Paper text:
Upon activation by RAS, RAF family kinases initiate signaling through the MAP kinase cascade to control cell growth, proliferation, and differentiation. Upon activation by RAS, RAFs phosphorylate their sole substrates MEK1/2, which then phosphorylate ERK1/2 (4, 5). Type II inhibitors bind (or induce) a conformation created by a crankshaft-like flip of the DFG segment that reorients the phenylalanine residue toward the ATP site. Here, we compare potency of type II inhibitors tovorafenib (TAK-580) and naporafenib (LHX254) in biochemical assays against the three RAF isoforms and describe crystal structures of both compounds in complex with BRAF.
In the BRAFV600E structure with tovorafenib, the inhibitor binds with its bisubstituted pyrimidine ring in the adenine-binding region of the ATP site, where it forms two hydrogen bonds to the kinase hinge (with the backbone amide and carbonyl groups of C532). Finally, the trifluoromethyl-substituted pyridine ring binds in the hydrophobic pocket vacated by the DFG phenylalanine (F595), with the trifluoromethyl group oriented toward the back of the pocket. An essentially identical binding mode is observed in the WT BRAF structure with tovorafenib. Density for the activation loops in both tovorafenib structures is not resolved between residues 599 to 613, which includes the site of the V600E mutation. Interestingly, for one subunit of the dimer in the tovorafenib BRAFWT structure, we observe formation of a domain-swapped dimer with an adjacent molecule in the crystal lattice (related by a crystallographic 2-fold axis of symmetry).
Residue numbers in the entry:
A (entry chain B): 449 to 599, 611 to 722
B (entry chain A): 449 to 599, 612 to 723
The structure:
């Protein structure tokens, strides 16, 4: 039972504010981060999202996954995790434009693959893996999490739903292969320093063209010192078909093998 | 269910042998440490000690406590934790040649109090807190555990409280016994030496401390030691258990002292 009684957490400075809840830096046996769900009376949808996100964080115990520490119910639905200093991988590659050596770029990819492999081993799909959700604790240790913001109908309405209405309410595209594709884009950001489709103006094109197998990230933007296995591993992780993308076991294996060759 | 099936962990080079079994550096979604009980037929006594140590490590989820990751039963009773680089606090203060600044010495005391408070909050008694069981992961993050051989001992007496020397059963182990152990750690941090370093043999240190006739020489503290620390150290080394403060009020004054130096 990881429930934290009301009165122990010392809510401090606010970190952000999303469509789900607000996040503060709290005091609880040290520095922690608390996502207070702005629900004085959570709806069953919001309550289920709370029980789902805590139920997933319970099964995680890894160096490269964000350390879950506890949750609260009174007087606000809250989730308490460790407090990490630094910035997100998106902030270092696309906002600050910090130059990482090729040694560290592979190390960040290795730790990310380590955390992702532990999730898939525990039968956990990230569903929203991106460089913004890859926090660099102390600018060294990679911490994977879901810092998201926007986190029944298939029952009483089923006798009247047309067949084509059921082609969109029983398909779950989120799978281990979808997380592999997300990891492939992260490899693109690490090895190119840019976001994919950087020459496209709007997102209306990027959505329809990528989903139809007509648009793929320009792999020629990789650095000159990029290892030839990284560009090949990146391409296999960005295959249009889901089955053609490799699994994280053999992904982490090739990255860790490349890491030991780089001194 | 944190049990790791047989065949996923790649046991590697032997590092040491602590607690019950020997400890190796293993491969399991990254670098991990595995303590395998090398007994093909463990006695129920050894099995119960295994079930107790995992039952306590399950209840731990803190930045300054060693991350438990899983256990094994086939073909050997094993415990899998994270793999941390660096050395123990005992190695840094009495073996290594580097002197830690007073800023970092207070930070090590803060992280130790943070981890110890989290243990006592979870109703967990360490029973054997000492600078040898305080690992400095990456020479920065303090990790508290029950190792044995991290990096003949003899001195494993110096952290036992006076009432712990008048043995009864499993009653002298209490939160006050761990507070006394923390006081000895404060002595090592603020003096750079072990307590009773001027005593020839161990025949005196055991009977004299247990009879309230021997206490660590507080005049051996450094000149730049804050006066708040010397008072907190003395109260943590009181002969009576009730006169020693609790880690809440211990961690409170340490973090309060830390913010006066960090700004
Ligand atoms: C309170 C807030 N903590 C911070 O924001 C924070 N923490 C450290 N350092 C900072 N600078 C900041 Cl700012 C958070 N509470 C829950 C968070 C979370 O990620 N849950 C989660 C994780 C997963 C994962 F398994 F993929 F990991 C999934 Cl699948 C689904 N949900 S994050
Ligand atoms: C597998 C082996 N790991 C290592 O040895 C190791 N790990 C990282 N880096 C290294 N260089 C090494 Cl060498 C371990 N398995 C269980 C360990 C342990 O401490 N259990 C424990 C913890 C507590 C606590 F609550 F106080 F935390 C208590 Cl009260 C009682 N028992 S340690």
């Amino acid at each position: 039972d990881w429930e934290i009684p009301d009165g122990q957490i010392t809510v401090g400075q606010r970190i952000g504010s999303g469509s789900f809840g607000t996040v503060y830096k709290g005091k609880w046996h040290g520095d922690v981060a608390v996502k207070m769900l702005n629900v004085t009376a959570p709806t069953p949808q919001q309550l289920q999202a709370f029980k789902n996100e805590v139920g997933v964080l319970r099964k995680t115990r890894h160096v490269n996954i964000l350390l879950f520490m506890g949750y609260s119910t009174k007087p606000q639905l809250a989730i308490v995790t460790q407090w990490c200093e630094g910035s997100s991988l998106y902030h270092h590659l696309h906002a600050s434009e910090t130059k990482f050596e090729m040694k560290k770029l592979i190390d960040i990819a290795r730790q990310t693959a380590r955390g992702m492999d532990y999730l898939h081993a525990k039968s956990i799909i990230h569903r929203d893996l991106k460089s913004n959700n890859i926090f660099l604790h102390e600018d060294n240790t990679v911490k994977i999490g879901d810092f998201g913001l926007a986190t029944e109908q298939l029952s009483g309405s089923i006798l009247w739903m047309a067949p084509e209405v059921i082609r969109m309410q029983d398909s779950n595209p989120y799978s281990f292969q979808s997380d592999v594709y997300a990891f492939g884009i992260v490899l693109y950001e690490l090895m190119t320093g840019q976001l994919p489709y950087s020459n496209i103006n709007n997102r209306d094109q990027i959505i329809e063209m990528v989903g139809r197998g007509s648009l793929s990230p320009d792999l020629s933007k990789v650095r000159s010192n990029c290892p030839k296995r990284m560009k090949r591993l990146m391409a296999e992780c960005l295959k249009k078909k889901r089955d053609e993308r490799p699994s994280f076991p053999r992904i982490l294996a090739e990255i860790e093998e490349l890491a030991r060759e780089l001194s």
